[PDB]
Swiss-Prot record, chain A:
Pfam families: PCI, RPN7, RPN7_PSMD6_C. Component of the 19S proteasome regulatory particle complex. The 26S proteasome consists of a 20S core particle (CP) and two 19S regulatory subunits (RP). The regulatory particle is made of a lid composed of 9 subunits including PSMD6, a base containing 6 ATPases and few additional components. InterPro entries: PCI_dom (IPR000717), Rpn7/CSN1 (IPR019585), Rpn7_N (IPR045135), RPN7_PSMD6_C (IPR049549), TPR-like_helical_dom_sf (IPR011990), WH_DNA-bd_sf (IPR036390). GO terms for biological process: proteasome-mediated ubiquitin-dependent protein catabolic process. GO terms for cellular component: cytosol; extracellular region; ficolin-1-rich granule lumen; nucleoplasm; proteasome accessory complex; proteasome complex; proteasome regulatory particle; secretory granule lumen. Residues 178-346 form the PCI domain. It comes from the Eukaryota. PROSITE patterns: PCI (PS50250). Component of the 26S proteasome, a multiprotein complex involved in the ATP-dependent degradation of ubiquitinated proteins. This complex plays a key role in the maintenance of protein homeostasis by removing misfolded or damaged proteins, which could impair cellular functions, and by removing proteins whose functions are no longer required. Therefore, the proteasome participates in numerous cellular processes, including cell cycle progression, apoptosis, or DNA damage repair. The gene is PSMD6. It comes from Homo sapiens.
From Swiss-Prot, chain B:
Phosphorylated by AMPK. This is 26S proteasome non-ATPase regulatory subunit 11. It is found in: Nucleus; Cytoplasm, Cytosol. The chain holds residues 98 to 199 of 422 of the full protein. Component of the 19S proteasome regulatory particle complex. The 26S proteasome consists of a 20S core particle (CP) and two 19S regulatory subunits (RP). The regulatory particle is made of a lid composed of 9 subunits including PSMD11, a base containing 6 ATPases and few additional components. Belongs to the proteasome subunit S9 family. GO terms for biological process: proteasome assembly; proteasome-mediated ubiquitin-dependent protein catabolic process; stem cell differentiation; ubiquitin-dependent protein catabolic process. It comes from Homo sapiens.
Swiss-Prot record, chain C:
Pfam families: DSS1_SEM1. This is 26S proteasome complex subunit SEM1. Its main location: nucleus. It comes from the Eukaryota. GO terms for cellular component: cytosol; integrator complex; nucleoplasm; proteasome complex; proteasome regulatory particle, lid subcomplex; protein-containing complex. Belongs to the DSS1/SEM1 family. The gene is SEM1.
Swiss-Prot record, chain D:
This is 26S proteasome regulatory subunit 8. Disulfide bonds: none annotated. Component of the 19S proteasome regulatory particle complex. The 26S proteasome consists of a 20S core particle (CP) and two 19S regulatory subunits (RP). The regulatory particle is made of a lid composed of 9 subunits, a base containing 6 ATPases including PSMC5 and few additional components. Component of a complex with USP49 and RUVBL1. Interacts with PRPF19. Interacts with TRIM5. Interacts with NDC80. Interacts with PAAF1. Interacts, in vitro, with the thyroid hormone receptor (in a thyroid hormone T3-dependent manner) and with retinoid X receptor (RXR). Interacts with ERCC6. It comes from the Eukaryota. Transmembrane segments: none annotated. Belongs to the AAA ATPase family. It is found in: Cytoplasm; Nucleus. It comes from Homo sapiens. Component of the 26S proteasome, a multiprotein complex involved in the ATP-dependent degradation of ubiquitinated proteins. This complex plays a key role in the maintenance of protein homeostasis by removing misfolded or damaged proteins, which could impair cellular functions, and by removing proteins whose functions are no longer required. Therefore, the proteasome participates in numerous cellular processes, including cell cycle progression, apoptosis, or DNA damage repair.
Amino acid sequence: PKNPDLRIAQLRFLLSLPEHRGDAAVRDELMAAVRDNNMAPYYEALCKSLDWQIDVDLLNKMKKANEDELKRLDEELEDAEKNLGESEIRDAMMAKAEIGDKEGALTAFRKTYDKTVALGHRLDIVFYLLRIGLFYMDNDLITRNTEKAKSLIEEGGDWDRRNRLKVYQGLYCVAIRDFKQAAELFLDTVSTFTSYELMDYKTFVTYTVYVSMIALERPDLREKVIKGAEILEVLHSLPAVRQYLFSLYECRYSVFFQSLAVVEQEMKKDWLFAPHYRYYVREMRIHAYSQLLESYRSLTLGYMAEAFGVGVEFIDQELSRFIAAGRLHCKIDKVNEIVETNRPDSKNWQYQETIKKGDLLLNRVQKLSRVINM
Amino acid sequence: DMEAATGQEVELCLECIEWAKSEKRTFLRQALEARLVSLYFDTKRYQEALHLGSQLLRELKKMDDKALLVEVQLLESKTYKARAALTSARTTANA
Amino acid sequence: MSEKKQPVDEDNWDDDNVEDDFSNQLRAEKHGYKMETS
Amino acid sequence: ASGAEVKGVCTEAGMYALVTQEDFEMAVAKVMQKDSEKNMS
């Protein structure tokens, strides 16, 4: 049941990334605390957001409710293992202990991993470790648990749950700058309709496109977005980035820049991207310019400055620092405003890699085969 | 079928649904639910058209009737997986 | 070994080298405000 | 039925769905028909 707790993770990100109205973080943390016993939101807001303007006792009462809850959980721990349970005593205690403080976590994972017995004992354990990680912007939890899973969960698994583990892997692959294996693991589209792991299938589409407009080269672009009309029956609900992708074939750079600003702000205000979203947009820029110049040579940026908006000075500094970033072999001027189609690998590079590696590894093995004697 | 007067259409429909909560006629409330979800598609409502189709089809294949089940499976195939929902409407339609 | 004088002495971390390479370009509107500049 | 016939009915069911109880019902319906043809009671 991590979808609402994924929304709570987004609450924590709102507490983290936007410090505009810290009461809004206090707002939804108190809203998640007044019911569902969720006190961890309340300590979380106490720390980063406001210091709980009025929640000294209004949430300490529900903290005492969580205290009685945890104490009766740990009492039924012995009341039920009094009876025989096929690791199901510890299974129930780990499930119910995955609400209040990290007390619930330490009575959750210290009582499952020791007697995790079958696929489900770790199926839910790894799903909910992914959730306890995703509440913050974690990667140790949400993939170390996948390591345990590889040791524990699947072993054949389901045609349903294993696709879910793979979609977890892809969900972090888009959370991190792993701009391909997300869409690879999000290539299912027949096994992630709706789940307690899918906070929103439309948000599934968001994470998917925010890795597919990069992983999917033009053939894979049309393969998954266009051809794969399975996601289209659902991405019919978010036409902004969809039409962006539509232009992403005809290469309409004006609307490219419109939606580029749009998605830039969007990522600026979206989870698990705050300290990294910098490249994606300028990467889209350079990649599109690549094909645009690849059209032909005797062309101008000014002829494209229209598509660039008023992009003469914009792209001046832009492509200056981009070629300075060592990108996109091409030619362009100011007094001449050139465009180019160049950089064939089978000119020298397809022959330069030869020594690039047969000297790197050559001397690697050389010194490696030097200390064999000296 | 007079005019797109959206101020009273969906509200009057929810009213006698609440009357059907208070009177409990099965065939009359199903008559009201089927047009309401058709009215939801007329403005193409995003989730609640699907959520009304979910909450009614928890009971429709559970209850005894067969004939209107074919329509509400078919109405979901417009709002949608749509190949899957159409084929389930295919095998129901033959009886 | 270190037998010399010297004994005297991915979340964003992966994207961090590019970030310091991004530390010189409009870190993150004037892009979009340039639309109405002309 | 000769043991694995449950598997075959599963195959017949899944084919209809391509698995509700009705699937296996139609599965046996293909499987079991003939026997049919009353009017000889």
